[PDB]
């Protein structure tokens, strides 16, 4: 047994839902726009002072062509994230539509509203304009899947509501002992080849993140 929660991630296309999920999953930042086809379910595990918790994130597609499948996606949903893009007013304009269709199927589930891409200077949806969370008593967060600004707070807020512990803490992941090294000769060549290609390929541009 383990503590699992189904989370449905919804929002207009291009708001960064998948990039947000992959940043948590592997730490990567995908710059390319590879639209999701239907839905992809990704497990995200967080470590708390009450043990590990797993969010089975249903990363749904924002394209309208999948609108007829969303009620099936939202089946057995225990929590949700509604995503919009602070550089695209239309994505915020649609937030009420995502919320309406969610609560028709789910009714009383914890829901977090996220305004993504706050790392971009030319912000179009100002904090003053964001009023829908006050309208539907939702939790809101400015986030950035690129700079990681607040990108963990949605899961922390939802985990507290789902667990019933308002003071649940995300703690350092226990560093278990890694496997021993056999240093076998046969498999070495394959890794040596993979390592030369990696050494030749240049690393990403130096950022001010460091």
């Amino acid at each position: 047994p383990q503590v699992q929660f189904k989370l449905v991630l919804v929002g207009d296309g291009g708001t960064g839902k998948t990039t947000f999920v992959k940043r948590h999953l592997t730490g990567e930042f995908e710059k390319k726009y590879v639209a999701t086809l239907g839905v992809e379910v990704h497990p995200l595990v967080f470590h708390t002072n009450r043990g590990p918790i797993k969010f089975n994130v249903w990363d749904t597609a924002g394209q309208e062509k999948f609108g007829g499948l969303r009620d099936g996606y939202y089946i057995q949903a225990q929590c949700a994230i509604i995503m919009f893009d602070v550089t695209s007013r239309v994505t915020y304009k649609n937030v009420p539509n995502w919320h309406r269709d969610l609560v028709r199927v789910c009714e009383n589930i914890p829901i977090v509203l996220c305004g993504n891409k706050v790392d971009i200077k030319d912000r179009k949806v100002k904090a003053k304009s964001i009023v829908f969370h006050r309208k539907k008593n939702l939790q809101y967060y400015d986030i950035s899947a690129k700079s990681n600004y607040n990108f963990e707070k949605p899961f922390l807020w939802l985990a507290r509501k789902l667990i019933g512990d308002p003071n649940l803490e995300f703690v350092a992941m226990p560093a278990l002992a890694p496997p021993e090294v056999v240093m076998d000769p046969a498999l070495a060549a394959q890794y040596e080849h993979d390592l030369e290609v990696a050494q030749t390929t240049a690393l990403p541009d130096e950022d001010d993140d460091l």
């Binding site: 503590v3 929660f5 948590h24 592997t26 730490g27 990567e28 930042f29 967080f46 470590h47 002072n49 009450r50 043990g51 225990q78 009383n108 589930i109 914890p110 990681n148 990108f151 963990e152 509501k161 789902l162 667990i163 019933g164 512990d165 995300f170 703690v171 350092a172 992941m173 226990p174 560093a175 278990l176 002992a177 890694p178 496997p179 021993e180 090294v181 240093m183 498999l187 070495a188 890794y191 040596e192 993979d194 390592l195 290609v197 990696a198 050494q199 030749t200 390929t201 240049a202 690393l203 990403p204 130096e206 993140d209 460091l210």
Partner: protein, 135 residues
């Protein structure tokens, strides 16, 4: 909102490093090579550490992402590893390891970068000092 699952008990929170001493600790950015896409992918930013167990003497490299505090590198340092500069850089290294960051043994080509060449040089120094007293 009412809870959905029973309230799991509090656990004794441990980092997993209590029985180890730090030979090195410094902020860095980690990368992992995706041979399918043939591109480096950001793996995590935070403190990379070299840890020696106080009784067994085994030494490992451990790195945590900021904010999430999740593990992005965890592998024992072996004498076969060799820190190799990436593209004539004086601030970054590449090497191969059987990593356990996801708690599954994965062979990975990793790259680590530091803000300054001095930080990178100290890392190489301690990484290779560990390789000389491996137990």
């Amino acid at each position: 909102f009412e809870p959905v699952v029973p309230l799991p008990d509090k656990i004794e929170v441990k980092t997993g490093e209590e029985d180890e001493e730090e030979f090195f600790c410094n902020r860095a950015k980690l990368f992992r090579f995706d041979v399918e896409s043939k591109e480096w992918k950001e793996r995590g930013i935070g403190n990379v550490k070299i840890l020696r167990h106080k009784t067994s003497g085994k030494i490992r490299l451990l790195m945590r992402r900021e904010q999430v505090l999740k593990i992005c590198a965890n592998h024992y340092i072996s004498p076969d590893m060799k820190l190799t500069p990436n593209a004539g850089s004086d601030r970054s290294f590449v090497w191969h390891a059987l990593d356990y960051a996801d708690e599954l043994p994965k062979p990975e080509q990793l790259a680590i970068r530091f803000k300054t060449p001095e930080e990178a040089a100290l890392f190489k120094c301690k990484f290779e000092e560990a390789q000389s007293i491996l137990k």
